[PDB]
Design a protein around this ligand. Structure first.
Ligand code: CNC
Ligand code: CA
Ligand code: CA
Ligand code: CA
Ligand code: CA
Lengths: 400, 78
């Protein structure tokens, strides 16, 4: 059976795109987002001339910062920039292009070395970024050595060490699919074929009773991967229809606010995936997005949220009053204003990432986890999760 | 129609840095920007005309990782 997601309501799709639209005018390097560009080009929606300026800004920023900048882009982000080039039917080229390719190849080589011949060491970033890097190079018909592919193969193959999310497995599966379709790494062809099936099975076995694969925000990338190949013996069609039901409910309940998440979902709703960047169709008609004329406004209600940090001595626990509809980040700002609380964030393609709390920065294989009561990890970051009145938000330094 | 310390793409108003003016790359859609013109680690190999080291596995992989492309030269091999 095949993984098919029947077209959703055009109105519903349009309002998703309108969430992306304001970002088209935010061209500062801290806000530039190659995933947004890619998601839009693969969608049924377009931003017209704004897109061309956006790509131009991407090319200026990424090439000047990495070859010649305030907090220049990461290698993982460089990989997504490569996807953005494919989305405009370009191959990375010229002397500047060649150098960018080799920088991404160095990233993979360093992660391979960090992982080790034994496969105990972690990558310095994630296996998600490792897969993303292989995919990005493959989409531009750039080859990586079998030894590089081997680390991704071992990570998903039987008796592998560690546990990977649905997102990570899906990204790996996409990388494997590009290698297979391109007939790259022929000395790993059978293992690559087997790994794709392995990822299929693990993703299907991660489907919740609601219908999501892992969770609501893993479902988009999971669907992208599942759409790329048949799955004989399995009921892929049924699983994907159940996911659509789950996806539809989540959409109608306002689950998708984050621009990166929308950019990963929009291709699915247009029956496209990142694998369509092998043979891109850049001139396919797309509906022009117009700004949602919209009176947003304004709450009159005050809510109180308890903010707590038990990972530090002495511990922090305070009730914070904010306007209803405020984010966790607003709570953090208010806590800082009241005195006795500090924190730090850094920019990412998903928005502000919490890196430090009350002077304590997360170290290697550590992060500040966001939770609500009771002991329940948030599915959104500080700038997207909007706590309800009486909620308790915890920041917890954890190791993974 | 926009600042100094920087060259402009003539045929479509997009504006680009001067490090790209006459640099063999087609950065402008029209191509105007080109017209008025140490030890190596084990398992690595040195690029013939420079200081650079690359992994041995980048030899003959279809992409010039060396500035002089020496890693892709004797690559019609057996
Ligand atoms: C790896 C990973 C993943 N994560 Co995290 C998970 N699990 N994540 C990160 C890890 C980063 C560290 C590392 N060494 O890689 C990890 C485990 C620590 C992290 C943290 C969690 N993650 C979380 C979620 C919910 C997000 N994460 C994802 C991006 C989920 C991702 C899956 C996905 N579908 O995208 C994910 C698989 C891949 C991200 C990536 O590398 N993209 C490629 C990269 C090139 O882009 P980038 O923007 O430069 O990557 C940076 C950011 O993604 C930042 N970051 C990671 N997660 C988030 C989440 C938010 C909300 C923000 C603003 C930034 C981040 O870390 C990366 C830098 O290394 C997201 C889809 C995952 C999911 N399916 O649930 C989701 C995000 C959902 C959404 N509505 O936006 C947490 C909030 C969980 C929690 N309750 O604490 C938390 C972030 C808290 C904080 N301190 O701000
Ligand atoms: Ca969201
Ligand atoms: Ca520590
Ligand atoms: Ca040039
Ligand atoms: Ca080479």
């Amino acid at each position: 059976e095949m993984c098919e997601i029947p077209e959703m309501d055009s109105h519903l799709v349009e309002k998703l795109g309108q969430h992306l639209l304001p970002w088209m005018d935010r061209l500062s390097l801290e806000h530039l987002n190659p995933s947004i560009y890619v998601g839009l080009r693969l969608s049924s929606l377009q931003a017209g001339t704004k897109e061309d300026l956006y790509l131009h800004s991407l090319k200026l920023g990424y090439q000047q910062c990495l070859l010649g900048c305030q907090g220049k882009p990461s290698m993982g982000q460089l990989a997504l920039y490569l996807l953005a080039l494919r989305a405009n039917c370009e191959f990375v080229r010229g002397h500047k292009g060649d150098r960018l390719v080799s920088q991404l190849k160095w990233f993979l080589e360093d992660e391979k070395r960090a992982i080790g011949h034994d496969h105990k060491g972690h990558p310095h970033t994630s296996y998600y970024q490792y897969g993303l890097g292989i995919l990005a190079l493959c989409l531009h018909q750039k080859r990586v050595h079998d030894s590089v592919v081997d680390k991704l193969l071992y990570a998903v193959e039987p008796f592998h060490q560690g546990h990977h999310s649905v997102d990570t497995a899906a990204m790996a599966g996409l990388a494997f699919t590009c290698l297979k379709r391109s007939n790259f790494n022929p000395g790993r062809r059978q293992r690559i074929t087997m790994a794709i099936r392995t990822v299929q099975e693990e993703i299907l076995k991660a489907q919740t009773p609601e219908g999501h694969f892992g969770n609501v925000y893993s479902t988009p990338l999971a669907l992208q991967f599942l759409m790329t190949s048949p799955m004989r013996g399995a009921e892929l069609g049924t699983a994907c229809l159940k996911a659509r039901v789950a996806l539809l409910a989540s959409l109608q309940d306002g689950a998708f606010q984050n621009a990166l998440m929308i950019s990963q979902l929009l291709p699915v709703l247009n029956h496209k995936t990142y694998i369509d960047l092998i043979f891109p169709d850049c001139l396919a008609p797309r509906v022009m997005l117009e700004p949602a004329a919209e009176t947003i406004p304004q709450t009159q209600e005050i809510i109180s949220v308890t903010l707590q940090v038990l990972s530090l001595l002495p511990p922090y626990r305070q009730s914070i009053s904010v306007l209803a509809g405020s984010t966790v980040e607003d709570v953090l700002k208010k806590a800082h204003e009241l005195g006795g609380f500090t924190y730090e964030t850094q920019a990412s393609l998903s928005g502000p990432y919490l890196t430090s709390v009350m002077g304590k920065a997360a170290g290697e294989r550590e992060f500040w986890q966001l939770l609500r009561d009771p002991n329940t990890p948030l599915l959104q970051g500080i700038a997207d999760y909007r706590p309800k009145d009486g909620e308790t938000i915890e920041l917890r330094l954890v190791s993974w | 129609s926009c600042p100094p310390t920087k060259f402009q793409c003539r045929t479509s108003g997009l504006c680009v840095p001067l490090t790209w003016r006459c640099d063999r790359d087609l950065d402008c859609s029209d191509g105007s920007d080109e017209e008025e013109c140490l030890a190596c680690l084990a398992g690595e190999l040195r690029c013939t005309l420079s200081d650079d080291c690359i992994p041995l596995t980048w030899r003959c992989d279809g992409h010039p990782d060396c500035p002089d492309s020496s890693d892709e030269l004797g690559c019609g091999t057996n």
